[PDB]
């Protein structure tokens, strides 16, 4: 029943999920803002994302940024990530099915079945990884994007991105409520802002009290300033992805989000095809055999058949009761036959 459920699309959405967070990490580390660790002035970068829509089309920065972002994405361990992600998914399904199966008891037999699944996946792991990288070799050089793919990227990016924003906006508001007044949190934010500008200097690596704020309040403050900048950037980048400018595929350097997500869905499906073949059918065919052979060898070699029977209390008695009634019967048989071999 389970194997009749799994197939390949589940792998598709499995791969696309890790690859999705890879996109976010790449996209964040190439475009958005970096976190605030201390209270020193940050040196002012020349290029900013707010001015991304209205930028010269042939900008070596924004070009270098989207190009290093995509090649950083593609020259990743996609083969070994598809291999481990599918492995952990199959093995996790098997452990569940086992939890609900009649092997809830008998933990040695159960461990025999789990370890069989694991040893199958771990034997087949290499060929699947390296195979997937080799089949991806053409798409690493030219992941050429079709307008349909560009559309699918566009509809995804809006979902993925606003998901990033809601977790952001809740936690700002949760902050204000936890620190006290919205105005008091505005106060430490004005103070962190002041300190991040030249208006005021603090010169501490770990500042305990400045302007009447605790070490806890300075941390809540920087936290607040990081949340605010990345909240605004995220909405803006959602409005970018819903703009007319990103509907078309021609402004690829102006819509890093849609593009990176397109490359992620493509590499996901082509690596997935190989994955299912090399690895999934390998499981469905090696698993039942390995399960039976290790169970049999384990039962007959280690004598754990007898312990498998001794393990459940109800069958311990059932087998005990049957053997006792059998022994008395055979006894009475020997008595009556003894009277038979000797008349008196």
């Amino acid at each position: 029943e389970f194997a009749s459920s799994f197939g390949r699309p589940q792998l598709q959405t499995l791969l696309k999920d890790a690859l999705d967070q890879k996109v976010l990490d790449q996209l964040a580390a190439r475009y958005w803002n970096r976190p605030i660790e201390d209270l020193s002035p940050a040196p002012r970068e020349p290029d900013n994302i707010i001015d991304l829509p209205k930028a010269d089309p042939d900008s070596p920065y924004w070009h270098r940024q989207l190009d290093t972002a995509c090649s950083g994405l593609t020259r990743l361990g996609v083969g070994r990530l598809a291999a481990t992600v599918a492995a952990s998914a199959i093995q996790q399904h098997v452990e569940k099915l086992l939890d609900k199966s009649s092997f809830a008891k008998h933990p040695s037999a159960r461990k025999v079945i789990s370890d069989a699944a694991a040893t199958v996946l771990a034997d087949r792991s290499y060929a699947t990884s390296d195979g997937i990288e080799i089949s991806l070799k053409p798409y690493k050089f030219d992941p050429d994007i079709q307008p349909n793919e560009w559309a699918q990227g566009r509809e995804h990016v809006v979902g993925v991105l606003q998901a990033e924003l809601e977790q952001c906006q809740a936690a700002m508001k949760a902050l204000e409520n936890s620190v006290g007044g919205r105005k008091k949190l505005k106060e430490v934010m004005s103070f962190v802002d002041k300190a991040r500008k030249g208006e005021i200097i603090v010169e501490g690596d770990h500042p305990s009290g400045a302007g009447g704020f605790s070490a806890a309040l300075l941390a809540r403050g920087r936290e607040a300033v990081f949340l605010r900048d990345r909240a605004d950037i995220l909405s803006l980048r959602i409005q970018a992805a819903k703009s007319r400018q990103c509907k078309t595929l021609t402004n690829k350097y102006y819509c890093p989000e849609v593009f990176l997500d397109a490359v992620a869905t493509k590499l996901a499906q082509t690596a997935v095809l190989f994955l299912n073949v090399e690895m999934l059918n390998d499981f469905y065919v090696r698993f039942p055999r390995e399960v039976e052979a290790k169970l049999h060898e384990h039962m007959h070699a280690g004598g754990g058949l007898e312990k498998f029977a001794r393990e459940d209390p109800k069958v311990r008695r059932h087998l005990d009761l049957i053997r006792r009634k059998e022994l008395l019967e055979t006894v009475l048989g020997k008595i009556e036959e003894l009277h038979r071999i000797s008349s008196g």
Binding site: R75, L76, G77, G79, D130, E133, K137, K140
Partner: protein
């Protein structure tokens, strides 16, 4: 030395594999040499100049 010799031999074979794996994923195994790079950039320039 000799006792360590075999465990060292095995680790060395491994690090040779991984070195190959990154030589595969990030460079596609494109072999490179200094005089080669020099020859090709020279020729791209002489194309430019042509």
């Amino acid at each position: 030395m000799s006792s360590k010799l075999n465990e060292t031999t095995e680790a060395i074979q491994r690090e040779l594999e991984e070195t190959t794996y990154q030589f595969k994923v990030q460079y596609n195994e494109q072999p490179m040499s200094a005089e080669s790079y020099l020859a090709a950039s020279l020729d791209d320039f002489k194309h430019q100049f042509h």
